[PDB]
Design a protein around this nucleic acid. Structure first.
Length: 104
DNA sequence: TAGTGCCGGAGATGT
DNA sequence: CACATCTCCGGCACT
């Protein structure tokens, strides 16, 4: 109703003009917030939260671990991975979407 | 070092 | 009373 965080990220991850601060790493559904501050800034404006930052935003993401919606890529900073059936949800395969988005 | 990423508990919050 | 954060926090690990 009032868009969820994992849905927000997907929204960005499927818009070329947002590749500057968030993007697919080419490996399946794993993505990277190259500019966490910019992601958190936009997250903040969406939900109307002037004090939103990555520290908080990431707390939202860790909530998704048990929910098996998004998982953390251990070892790579600002990198996480959608572990849920995004193929059925979006209708595309990682390859198909990457292609469509021109992911390198 | 202190700074920063990252973790997950807990009370607060409400475009 | 639910619910998805939001906010804060003590902790651990790495550089």
């Amino acid at each position: 109703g009032p868009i969820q965080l994992w849905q927000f990220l997907l929204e960005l991850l499927t818009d070329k003009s947002c590749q500057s601060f968030i993007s697919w790493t080419g490996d399946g559904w794993e993505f990277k917030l190259s500019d966490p501050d910019e992601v958190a800034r936009r997250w903040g404006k969406r939900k109307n939260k002037p004090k939103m930052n990555y520290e908080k935003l990431s707390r939202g993401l860790r909530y998704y671990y048990d929910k098996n919606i998004i998982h953390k890529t251990a070892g790579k900073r600002y990198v996480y991975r959608f572990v849920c059936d995004l193929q059925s949800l979006l209708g595309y395969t990682p390859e198909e979407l990457h292609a469509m988005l021109d992911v390198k």
